[PDB]
Amino acid sequence: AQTQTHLNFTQIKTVDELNQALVEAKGKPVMLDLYADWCVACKEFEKYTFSDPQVQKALADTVLLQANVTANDAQDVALLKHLNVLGLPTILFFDGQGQEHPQARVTGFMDAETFSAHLRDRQP
């Protein structure tokens, strides 16, 4: 169509900005998407999974964060080490207390249906 509905992600660049966002999200679940222009699976996520109406509805009460590590500068490297991420794509989930749940990580592409199931069954 002429227009499209997208999830409104809050962009973060550093470990400190991530912490500030967690503090602000007290009591709410948080999802962090790690994206890079060279990561094909990441683009597929943005274009086909995060654009799905059912996926967007399932994330209605979740704080959405996103980090663009394309440049791969000092701050990007520091953020990835802090989170203990091996590669992209990687989507992390934090609970209302601000703690991550490693078992809920998504590390490969997932279509709208598979991702919706993950949220239903695995999101903290």
Give CA–CA dist 8/15, Å, rounded.
20
Give CA–CA dist 28/38, Å, rounded.
31
Give CA–CA dist 54/23, Å, rounded.
28
List C-alpha distances in Å: 124 to 2, 39, 58, 66.
36, 26, 13, 18
Contact 9, 66 (CB under 8 A): yes
Contact 93, 101 (CB under 8 A): yes
Q: In angstroms, what is the resolution? A: 1.9
Q: Within 10 Å of residue 98's Cβ, how many Cβ atoms?
A: 16
Experimental method: X-ray
Residue ranges and CATH numbers for the domains of the chain are: 1-124 (3.40.30.10)
